[PDB]
Amino acid sequence: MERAEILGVGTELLYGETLDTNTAEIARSLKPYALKVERTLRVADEVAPLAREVEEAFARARLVVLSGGLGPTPDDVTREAVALALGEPLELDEAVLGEIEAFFRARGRAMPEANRKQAMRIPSATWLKNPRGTAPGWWVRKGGKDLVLLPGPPPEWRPMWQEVLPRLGLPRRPYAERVLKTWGIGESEIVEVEVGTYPKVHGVEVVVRGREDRVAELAERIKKKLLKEVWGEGEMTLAEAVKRRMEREGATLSTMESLTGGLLGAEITRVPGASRFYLGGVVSYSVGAKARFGVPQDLLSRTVSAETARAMAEAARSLFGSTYALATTGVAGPDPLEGEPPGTVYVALAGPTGAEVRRYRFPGDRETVRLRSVYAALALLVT
Amino acid sequence: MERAEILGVGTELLYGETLDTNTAEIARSLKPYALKVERTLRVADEVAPLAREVEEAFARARLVVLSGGLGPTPDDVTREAVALALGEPLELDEAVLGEIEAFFRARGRAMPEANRKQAMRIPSATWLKNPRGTAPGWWVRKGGKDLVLLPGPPPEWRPMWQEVLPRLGLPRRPYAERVLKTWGIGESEIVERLGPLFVREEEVEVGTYPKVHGVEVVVRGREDRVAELAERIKKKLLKEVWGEGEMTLAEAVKRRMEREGATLSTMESLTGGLLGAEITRVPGASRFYLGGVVSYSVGAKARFGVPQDLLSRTVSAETARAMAEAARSLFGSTYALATTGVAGPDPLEGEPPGTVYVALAGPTGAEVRRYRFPGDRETVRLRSVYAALALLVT
Ligand code: NA
């Protein structure tokens, strides 16, 4: 089996100032292909060491993928390092220049001198169009091997890489993964090709991976064994599950939040099409705010309670006129509140036939508790 | 300046099934020493590729550090690979084999035969004690070079590494670094402004890192060069620098509210509550943040004060101003932030994705800033959050 070599470029990656997920993510995209990944690299922003690593990686590999260092500054030196590794001169493409120029003009700017170098390429390189940035990528086909240069930011490289990957003509292998996403059941209970369990803030994922035939058969048997706990598969998320229920019913949604601070509204609206059902929300972070939008005076001294969660959901529902409304209240941490520890949370749903509350006691730090709270609220609608 | 190579062993680190933070953490620990980290590797659990990588890393470096693959599984092959790469045989340390039996004996169990592996060392290796797990590591000194094998789990390796590092005899170099966080200025403009201040040399280097929260500028290297150079750069970037070091925008906004005795509220469209979420990330937000509304539908925009004539152009500077002034009046806060715009993937009101207006209303009036952010939907949302926060700290 031939090798794929994957290099992330950036000194800040070495030190984990920015965490290298790009190389990992590209390696994962390569599993359906019959290439071996023996190693991945993160390389500092220096021309000579980078050219050496690129030269060596290309020498031993069917495929080399580089990610990062395509910006306009003196620390972006990937194009120079690759040209040096392949013994080709860099040459300015006037058509690409016009396009960078147009990119800046739309934004009401003139094109800075330093961006000119992003329109440079070696003669062996075909351009990869960057739909979201000024630096197009490269695709070098040479001696039966492929070298691909990609931008560092994921919104640029993801669409680029999806487009070019099939075109590389790599040998395929029948690998697959199936992800079953559950809620409200611990790892231990679940236990009662390879099958793994993965605890996340949105619930425990059951992952089945390996030979596509065996993945297919096995995954069906497991989903059956976990039929009521499974809320979605693959790319499905709780927010998207909510959106599907809302559109099915022609229903609307609104929210009132305290400890989640607006994170619940943020997670609902993350999904395209949220405007078809989501009317809006209130972040009632102070006592004054809670009263002003409908929570009864009698409850304002006991905010960490089932009664308050219920009252907040009712108040949001009457304020927005939505079919359904979700509310969050409780203790995110680090401090206790009203004698209750961090991770003490009540989520509530108000709908046509009344309200329901669930209490949770969530482990984790402040941000973790906020996240688990957001997903517990969405789970009221889809579990 | 001599090289330090750092290898993380484990096939799952490649695919990010376990996030590799060990190599970066080892790399940071090397900062006070005059060694160059040109690269770090993650290597699969396979003896021949690993031996090759170790062999190459050791030939080019003053120091090689390996992390992981010291267990009892067939997939734990680091000891072998190193023995192979360095041209020395694996030798069984009887005592160590004892210590390992004691580990299992203190748990009610007899030692599995698999764990026998863990008592092999090469002649060049002296042991590094692991009182917190099964496998001890190695310190190998050879040809004036050092090679170290560390266990994978951090509670195990951190103490070990902390004890052996000051014994390696590495050249020392007084190190400093300075991180400047800017907003409202692109990388190309920073390059032009800094000119020859954008030094990249062996003694000291300047780097720029574009983030959703603005361009970060880092100066690192020799302590005596870093202070002065960083200061000159700060001077050139003065009005655009909002924080240093560990500082975050949300923390910066918290400092200004506490300093003034002032309160804050928000009104959000495209960000959907993400601005309030970011503000309340910081412990102690309730001392100043009164709350906010997410006016996602047209009906909710009108309910919370957006003028009816503006509802055909919610993506505009006039609307942003109106939103910020409405939240201010509605919550009685000293300040209010607003966001309005087009997240993507579709246009809205004829305006393309990335079109964003953020506004701030306060005691002396209101102001609005306009942006055309590239990125996907989640990116534009995030940029808008930080753009709104930057209004209060410029
Ligand atoms: Na880049």
Specify the DSSP element, H or E, that contains A12.
Answer: helix A11-14
- Give how far B160 is from chain A: nearest CA, Å: 20
Q: Which of B14, B188, B375 lies at the smallest CB-CB distance from A37?
A: B14
Q: Could you tell me if B62 and B3 are in contact, meaning their C-beta atoms sit under 8 angstroms apart? A: yes
Phi-psi region of A52 (alpha: psi -120 to 50; beta: other; left: phi over 0): alpha
CATH superfamily of B248-394: CinA-like (3.90.950.20)
Amino acid at B364: T
Shared fold status for A1-173 and A174-236: no
Asked if B26 contacts A42 with a C-beta cutoff of 8 angstroms, the reply is no
Q: What DSSP designation does A68 have?
A: S
B244/chain A closest Cα distance in angstroms: 14
**Is residue B343 within 8 Å of residue B381, measured between CB atoms?**
yes
Q: Which residue has the tokens 């290597």?
A: B43
Cα dihedral: A86, A88, A90, A94 (round 10): -110
Q: What is the CATH number of domain A1-173?
A: 3.40.980.10
Domain B173-247 indexed as CATH 3.40.50.300 = no
Method: X-ray
Q: What is the DSSP string of A272-300?
A: TTGGGTEEEEEE--SHHHHHHTT--GGGT
From chain A, pick out residues whose CB is under 8 angstroms from the CB of B280. 261-262, 283, 285
Q: Which of B75, B98, B69, B84 lies closest to B9, judged by CA?
A: B69
What's the gap between Cα B187 and its chain centre? Answer: 19
Contact indicator for A66, A55 with CB cutoff of 8 Å? no
- Nearest CA-CA partner of A245 in A220, A268, A262: A268
State the distance from the centre of ligand 1 to the C-alpha of A21, rounded, in angstroms.
14
Which pair of tokens denotes residue A245? 């229920």
Collapsing DSSP to helix, strand or coil, A373 comes out as helix
The span from the CA of A206 to the CA of A224, in Å, is 12
B1-172: CATH topology is: Molybdenum Cofactor Biosythetic Enzyme; Chain A (3.40.980)
- B376: tokens are 């996907």
Interface of B with A in 270-289 (CB under 8 A): 271-277, 279-281, 283, 285-286, 289
Looking only at the bridges linking them, the beta strands covering A125-128 and A203-211 are unpaired
3-state secondary structure chain B: CCEEEEEEECHHHHHCCCCCCHHHHHHHHCCCECCECCEEEEECCCHHHHHHHHHHHHHHCCEEEEECCCCCCCCCCHHHHHHHHHCCCCEECHHHHHHHHHHHHCCCCCCCHHHHHHHEECCCEEEECCCCCCCCEEEEEECCEEEEEECCCHHHHHHHHHHHHHHCCCCECCEEEEEEEECCCCHHHHHHHHHHHCCECCCEEEEEEEECCEEEEEEEEEHHHHHHHHHHHHHHCHHHEEEECCCCHHHHHHHHHHHHCCCEEEEECCCCCHHHHHHCCCCCHHHCEEEEEECCCHHHHHHCCCCHHHCCCCCCHHHHHHHHHHHHHHHCCCEEEEEEECCCCCCECCECCCEEEEEEEECCEEEEEEEECCCCHHHHHHHHHHHHHHCCCC
Closest CA to B358 of B386, B334, B379, B330: B386
CB atoms within 10 A of CB B377: 19
Alpha-carbon span B45 to B69, nearest angstrom? 7
CB atoms within 10 A of CB B293: 31
Q: Does A171 lie at the interface with B, CB-CB under 8 angstroms?
A: no
Cα angle A348-A352-A355, degrees, rounded to a multiple of 5: 25
Tell me whether B202 touches chain A (CB under 8 Å): no
Q: Is B227 on the interface with A (CB under 8 A)?
A: no
Report the C-alpha gap between B361 and B368 in whole angstroms. 9
b/e map of A285-298 (b: 16 or more CB within 10 Å)? bbbbbbebbbbeee
> Measured in angstroms, how far is the CA atom of residue B165 from the centroid of ligand 1?
34
What fold characterizes domain A237-383? Maf protein (3.90.950)
Q: What architecture is the A174-236 domain classified under in CATH?
A: 2-Layer Sandwich (3.30)
Rounded to whole angstroms, the Cα distance separating A31 from B155 reads 32
- Structural domain spans, chain A: 1-173, 174-236, 237-383
The answer to whether the Cα torsion of B349, B352, B354, B356 is positive or negative is: negative
Q: Cα B115 to chain center, whole Å?
A: 36
The encoded tokens of residue B300 equal 């909710």
- Asked if residue B129 lies in contact with residue B102, where contact means CB atoms within 8 angstroms, the answer is no
